[PDB]
């Protein structure tokens, strides 16, 4: 809830950050030092890596993409510099996409992955007054699609939630959405 | 190849690797670490009669996050 | 040398008939389950908190655990059972619960570590005795205080056994380890 | 008829369903929502975007259940 993400280091010295609570469940997470992993000058892990998770008779081997130390699933921005607008144990908001500055991706924390995962929720900040024009809606959404589609590890279902302002202070930052435009 | 192994530890908990006492202290948010070469190790974390155990199998370089389970849990 | 204890309070949950219990439950999205039967030995205190003994069922990873738990002021306790006795919960958090208020040994406390897989606090043998270091120079006094504490707490022990006694000048209930600063351990 | 309380975490935006039928429940204190169920076998589903969590509920005895619905399709991650 109010808890901060915990920082962990790779042997080389680079740092990653996620939520790990002690469930004494025998669970494990292994992040191999890999050739696709990079360290930022800020000391935070960046890049992609295959992780091995084991818990309760299930092994998962997702390829995760790190941004500012945060492990992300279902998104691979390669080297693109994005910003984590907000991150907590419930959700992470991805922004700073110069190609669509008023658009964001929502990633919900997946406990079994110890990472934030993209499940299709994109948020587009647009004045309700402007949304009285189906053409202006289409252009804003087309722009967000163009900017975010290349980062979708698996190009996947993309729904654009139109809001007047992102509520980074809320668990659901798209609360108050007035319109939903399906993407591709 | 060397790997880092992180585990949650409370003050007063004793850590042993293969029976050998390890003077590790929990850090930010009660997390402790060991740097290990390739191999198998018997991690034991004891809090009085409470025993948490996990076999660590290190092979490649990287970082492990582990949550050792309590042995002999009441109800088992 | 002990950090300050986590301040988050236990979450309150109710039974069909209105009584309540309190523990820590995190969403691990893994199919985990906890079932508390409205059993006959479980009564509601006037504080509305569950009290008494009950078998709880926990399932996760295709595995089941069926511990007998003793509810004291709503808190699920394992490896300790005082029936209808009233004890003092000095502190209770996601890390540990401190039991005191034993009439037969005031100045003595039991430490119970939170067991995530049980969603309950379990006793693992740790007892704390508040005793000045000057008194501890006399072995007659140490033997007296430790024997009183053992005699006072052994009736509540599911499996009667030698307890480890940590002598402290003062209990640090604000810290993760309340026995931080213990100057001697009798066992 | 209802003999058991079932508690689960429910965030704003999430829809809970039982046997395919959405339930109008709101998270009370602690971020937990509750359902009162009679004896029976129920499939609990929580949906938000493309994320689906599922839990099979076997209700027989009177009491309280705390459940953590499992996310479906993590092997595809």
CATH code for position D32: 2.60.40.2070
Contact yes or no for B65 and A10 at CB 8 A: no
Whole-number Å distance between alpha carbons of B21 and A138: 65
Q: Per-residue DSSP letters for B22-67? A: E-----TTSEEEEEE-SEEEEEEEEETTEEEEEEEEE-SSEEEEE-
Closest Cα of chain C to D64: distance in Å? 5
> Across the interface, which of B10, B50, B74 has its CB nearest the CB of C176?
B10
Contact (CB<8Å) A108/D48: yes
Establish how many alpha carbons lie within 13 A of residue A125's alpha carbon, considering only the half-sphere containing its beta carbon: 11
Alpha carbon distances (Å) from D33 to A96, A169, C117, D66, D70 = 35, 22, 22, 10, 16
Using left for φ > 0, alpha for ψ between -120 and 50, and beta otherwise, residue B39 falls in: left
**Chosen from C61, C63, C114, C176 to mutate, greatest number of chain A CBs within 10 A:** C61
Chain C residue with minimal CA distance to A89? C27
- Nearest CA to A125 out of A93, A171, A79 is that of A93
Method used to solve the structure = X-ray
D63-67 and D4-9: which strand pairing? parallel
Closest to A28 (Cβ–Cβ): which among B28, B61, B66?
Answer: B66
Please check whether residue A131 is in contact with residue A178, taking contact to mean a CB–CB distance below 8 angstroms: yes
Interface test with C, best of D58, D63, D67 (most C CBs within 10 A): D63
Q: How far apart are CA D14 and CA D24, in angstroms?
A: 11
Residue contact D66–C16, C-beta within 8 A: no
CA distance D67 to chain A (A): 14
Q: Are strands A115-125 and A159-163 parallel, antiparallel or unpaired?
A: parallel
Beta-carbon separation of C30 and A55 below 8 A: yes
- A14–chain C nearest CA distance, Å: 26
Query: Which of C26, C115, C117 is opposite residue A21, by nearest beta carbon?
Result: C26
For residue D70, give the chain A residue with the closest CA: A112
**Pairs of residues, one from chain A and one from chain C, whose beta carbons lie less than 8 Å apart:** 38
Length of chain C: 187
Domain residue limits at B61: 3-70
| Cβ distance of C119 and D2 shorter than 8 Å | no
Q: What is the dihedral of CA C20, C22, C27, C28, to 10 degrees?
A: -120
Phi, psi values for residue A138, rounded to 5°: -60, -40
Tell me the C-alpha distance between C105 and C152, whole Å.
6
Whether the Cβ atoms of residue A113 and residue A28 lie closer than 8 Å to each other: no
Asked if residue D77 is part of any domain, the answer here is no
Size of interface A-D (CB pairs under 8 A): 42
On whether any CB of chain A is under 8 Å from the CB of C116, the answer is yes
Answer for the pair A138, A114: CB distance below 8 angstroms, yes or no.
Answer: no
In a domain, D13, yes or no: yes
Chains D and B touch (3+ CB pairs under 8 A): no
Count other Cβ atoms within 10 Å, centred on residue C18: 8
Report if residue B76 sits inside a domain.
no
Angstrom distance (rounded) from CA B71 to CA A49: 33
Residue B75, domain member (yes or no): no
CB contact under 8 A, D65 and C14: no
**Residue D76 belongs to some domain of the structure:** no
Rounded CA gap, D58 and D45, in Å? 14
**Of the candidates C2, C40, C44, the residue with the CA atom closest to the CA atom of residue C19:** C44
Partner residue facing C14 (CB), from D5, D62, D69: D5
| Inter-residue contact C108 to C148 (CB < 8 Å) | yes
In chain A, where do the E strands start and end? 6-9, 15-18, 28-32, 37-39, 45-50, 52-55, 58-60, 63-67, 70-73, 83-87, 91-95, 103-110, 115-125, 159-163, 179-182
What's the gap in Å between the CA of C86 and the closest CA on chain B?
23
- CB spacing of B50 vs C176 below 8 angstroms: no
**How far is it, in rounded angstroms, from Cα C173 to Cα C151?**
23
The DSSP 8-state label assigned to residue A132 in this structure reads G
CA distance B8 to chain C (A): 11
**Pseudo-torsion of CA A14, A19, A23, A28, nearest 10°?**
-40
Residues of D with CB under 8 A from a CB of A: 11-13, 48-51, 71, 74-75, 77
Q: Which residues of C touch A112 (CB under 8 A)?
A: 28-30
Q: Is C64:C58 a contact under the CB 8 Å cutoff?
A: yes
The total number of structural domains in chain D stands at 1
**Residue A89 has which token pair?**
């144990």
Q: Would you call C140 an interface residue with chain A, using a CB distance cutoff of 8 Å? A: no
Element (H, E) at C50: strand C50-55
């Amino acid at each position: 809830d109010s808890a901060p993400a915990q920082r962990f280091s790779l042997p080389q010295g680079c740092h990653f950050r996620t939520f790990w609570r002690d469930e004494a469940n025998g669970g494990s997470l292994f992040i191999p030092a890999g050739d696709a992993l990079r360290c930022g000058e800020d000391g935070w892990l960046q890049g992609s890596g295959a992780v091995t998770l084991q818990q309760g008779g299930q092994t998962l081997s997702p390829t995760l993409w790190f941004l500012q130390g945060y492990p992300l699933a279902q998104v691979n921005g390669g080297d693109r510099a994005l910003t984590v607008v907000s991150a907590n144990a419930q959700r992470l908001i991805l922004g700073g996409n110069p190609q669509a500055p008023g658009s964001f991706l929502l990633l919900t924390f997946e406990p079994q992955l110890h990472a934030w995962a993209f499940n299709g929720e994109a948020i587009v900040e647009m004045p309700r007054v402007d949304a009285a024009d189906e053409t202006k809606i289409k252009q804003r959404v087309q722009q967000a699609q163009t900017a975010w589609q290349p980062l979708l590890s698996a190009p996947a279902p993309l729904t654009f939630k139109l809001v007047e302002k992102l509520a980074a202070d809320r668990v659901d930052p798209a609360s108050g959405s007035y319109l939903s435009v399906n993407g591709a | 190849p060397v790997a880092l192994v992180y585990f949650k530890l409370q003050p007063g908990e004793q850590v042993s690797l293969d029976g050998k006492p390890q003077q590790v202290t929990a850090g930010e948010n009660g997390f402790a670490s060991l740097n290990l070469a390739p191999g198998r190790y018997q991690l034991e974390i004891r809090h009085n009669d409470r025993l948490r155990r996990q076999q660590l199998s290190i092979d490649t370089a990287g970082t492990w996050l582990v949550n050792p389970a309590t042995a002999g849990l009441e109800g088992s």
